[PDB]
Amino acid sequence: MTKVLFVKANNRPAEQAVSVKLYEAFLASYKEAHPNDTVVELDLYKEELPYVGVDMINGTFKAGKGFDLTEEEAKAVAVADKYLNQFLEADKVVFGFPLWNLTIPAVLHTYIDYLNRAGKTFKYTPEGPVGLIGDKKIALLNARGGVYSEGPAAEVEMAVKYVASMMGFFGATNMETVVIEGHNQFPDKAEEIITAGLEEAAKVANKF
Amino acid sequence: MTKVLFVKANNRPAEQAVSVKLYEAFLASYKEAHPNDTVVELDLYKEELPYVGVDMINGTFKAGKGFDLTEEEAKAVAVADKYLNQFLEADKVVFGFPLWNLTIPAVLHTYIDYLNRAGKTFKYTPEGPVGLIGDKKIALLNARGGVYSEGPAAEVEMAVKYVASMMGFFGATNMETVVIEGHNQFPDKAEEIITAGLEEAAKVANKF
Numbered sequence A, B: 001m002t003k004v005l006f007v008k009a010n011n012r013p014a015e016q017a018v019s020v021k022l023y024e025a026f027l028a029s030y031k032e033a034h035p036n037d038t039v040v041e042l043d044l045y046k047e048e049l050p051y052v053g054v055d056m057i058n059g060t061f062k063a064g065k066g067f068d069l070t071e072e073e074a075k076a077v078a079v080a081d082k083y084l085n086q087f088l089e090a091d092k093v094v095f096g097f098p099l100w101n102l103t104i105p106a107v108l109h110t111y112i113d114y115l116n117r118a119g120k121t122f123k124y125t126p127e128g129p130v131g132l133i134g135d136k137k138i139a140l141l142n143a144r145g146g147v148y149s150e151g152p153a154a155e156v157e158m159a160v161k162y163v164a165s166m167m168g169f170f171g172a173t174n175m176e177t178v179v180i181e182g183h184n185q186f187p188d189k190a191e192e193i194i195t196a197g198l199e200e201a202a203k204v205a206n207k208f
């Protein structure tokens, strides 16, 4: 069966978080369109996500070489490996996140840090890195209260741009992006903006 | 006495991390120039930095209003408050960080998340937010192995740009930035690049 992983990075209620409403609608539409696919949800707010530091950096280096590790190094590699393996095994991955403080939630930042692994998501070559996830389909789902595609905030969008950039580095192509934006900044258009976004979400989900 | 806070976000050894070498040289130069200033180091890798989620978001909202909180909400606010208060009390703050995966370490991302607080680092007004840290001097110290000021990576620098953007939102002005870049990409120039950077660090530190 096709394996689809949904990575959710917002534990606020749907009633208050358009990004969660977006995620839920895409999820529901995907399941309706493809009921035989094995869909798994990874809720990053239910996971233990130790931060990447020296133990995880040295650890992954040593692990890759088959060298001895401290217990703390081994534990760090094992955490990263769990998520990385699940991500690699997925045929399709859907990221659902808000824009908070110009970027993604720090939980998703740590998750992405785990996915960067030589020999797994990219490889070094004498002419530069080559991404290894070319076959994997990725969808990015973001809601943000202000507009970031134009105007004074356009140069500081670091949420979608962040995720897209790292996925591109890993070799992902033809990614789908659904953005709902502006509903808090233009409150009189909030209902229209979200409705349109949720319809877009269902269309994308049906082709994804 | 003037109060200076150094926020360190890299637990790799100086011998291997130019960003740590940079931080240490700026620190040493600052202390030599201003030995009577009270300098405190906050090493984010020694701190417990719970991620920002619904408890911390609801919690801070409720706290601000003087409303009742769950124990988990109260604990989240208290963590954020500890760091926020220390940051507010500092006359000067120095951030030392690498560029990893296009951005700052996730520990520093969570730290910055804590600093965003209505009534503390900014205020809402009927004509938009006004930053409240205009009097605070900020220095940003970054090292990165590749070049991000020009070339194919220039559009994806999200480490300095991230920190600068949030500090600017809080109302910081005339910030000092010291960047050492390119030493891994141009290894034959690594010694020259780092030496020049450490000299720049000492100059800035003497005026800071």
Ligand SMILES: [Cl-]
Binding pocket: A051, A052, A053, A054, A055, A056, B011, B045
């Ligand atoms: Cl560590």
Ligand SMILES: [Cl-]
Binding pocket: A011, A045, B051, B052, B053, B054, B055, B056
């Ligand atoms: Cl939470």
